């Protein structure tokens, strides 16, 4: 492939460099339309800019935490982190979010990796070996109330059991209701005067519940869960302007008030180098 062809002096009536940008086109002008060039080859394919590659590496999408401790006398397991739960979503952390929102609709399979590490912040004789159980609780299915409810039987709901310190990995097909996931949605769930605006209403994915299977030892053990997400088989439509201001909320476009100028001011003139 040639990156530049050889081109010499020109004295024409045919001027490729004068255009009318009002038309909305970006005319494909090249170095050889306005200087004299020599042949050179590309030596490159643009492999690593493919959208599959761009969205295809694992990104941290969520960090939660649960603890193993005596539940005796706990009136609210959920509240004691005896078993946390996460409202699956993909905009809670921002590195990956800005990347996805370069597109309007996106379609892909997900590969999740879940790393779990334990901490024992206060005096323990040892490090126990805990097994985590993460359940998929899609919307419409009983959601766990205690850390050892009938729910955890999970007879119809996919669940994975792995050890703290290890990693769990599995992959979920594209579960969207439509043909693509909306990265943006300028609508409501119905014509209500006070219903919420955004995608929050569309990206109804349900939540995922984690717990330790082990009963309690004499000390307490903090287990912190990190969920990583990798898109595989990516398809993206309609590019948009990149995110400039900071994010404030999952699912709304809102930016913070009295934010700071995002364009760097010159130290000098327009004329400055």
């Amino acid at each position: 492939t040639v990156a530049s062809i050889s081109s010499g002096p020109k004295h024409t009536q045919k001027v490729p460099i004068l255009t009318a940008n009002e038309t909305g086109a970006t005319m494909p002008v090249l170095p050889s339309d306005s200087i004299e060039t020599r042949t050179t080859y590309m030596h490159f394919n643009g492999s690593e800019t493919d959208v599959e590659c761009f969205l295809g590496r694992a990104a941290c999408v969520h960090v939660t935490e649960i603890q193993n401790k005596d539940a005796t006398g706990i009136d609210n397991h959920r509240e004691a982190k005896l078993f946390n739960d996460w409202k699956i979503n993909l905009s809670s952390l921002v590195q990956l979010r800005k990347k996805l929102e370069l597109f309007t609709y996106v379609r892909f399979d997900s590969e999740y990796t879940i790393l779990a590490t334990a901490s024992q912040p206060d005096s323990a004789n040892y490090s126990s070996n805990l097994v985590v159980q993460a359940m998929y609780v899609p919307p419409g299915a009983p959601n766990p109330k205690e850390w050892d409810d009938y729910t955890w039987q999970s007879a119809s709901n996919p669940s994975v059991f792995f050890k703290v310190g290890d990693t769990s990995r599995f992959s979920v097909p594209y579960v969207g209701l439509a043909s693509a996931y909306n990265c943006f949605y300028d609508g409501y769930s119905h014509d209500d005067a006070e219903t919420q605006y955004g995608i929050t209403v569309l990206n109804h994915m349900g939540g995922m519940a984690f717990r330790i299977v082990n009963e309690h030892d004499e000390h307490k053990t903090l287990v912190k869960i990190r969920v990583y997400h990798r898109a595989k088989h990516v398809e993206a439509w309609i590019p948009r302007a990149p995110r400039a201001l900071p994010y404030t909320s999952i699912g709304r476009t809102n930016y913070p008030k009295n934010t700071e100028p995002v364009i760097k001011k010159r130290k000098g003139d327009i004329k400055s180098y």
Binding site: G46, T49, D50, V51, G56, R57, A58, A59, F103, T104, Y105, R107, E111, T113, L115, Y136, P158, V160, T167, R169, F170, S171, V172, P173, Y174, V175, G176, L177, A178, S179, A180, Y228, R230, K232, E235, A236, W237, I238, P239
Partner: peptide
């Protein structure tokens, strides 16, 4: 766990059938 490696994994939802794709103008590849 290398965030950049690319391997196979078991599907959590065995046998599930994704929504059909319809046509949408504007697809980006690179």
């Amino acid at each position: 766990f290398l965030t950049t490696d690319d391997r196979q994994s078991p599907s959590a939802l065995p046998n599930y059938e994704p929504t059909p794709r319809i046509h949408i103008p504007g697809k980006v590849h690179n």
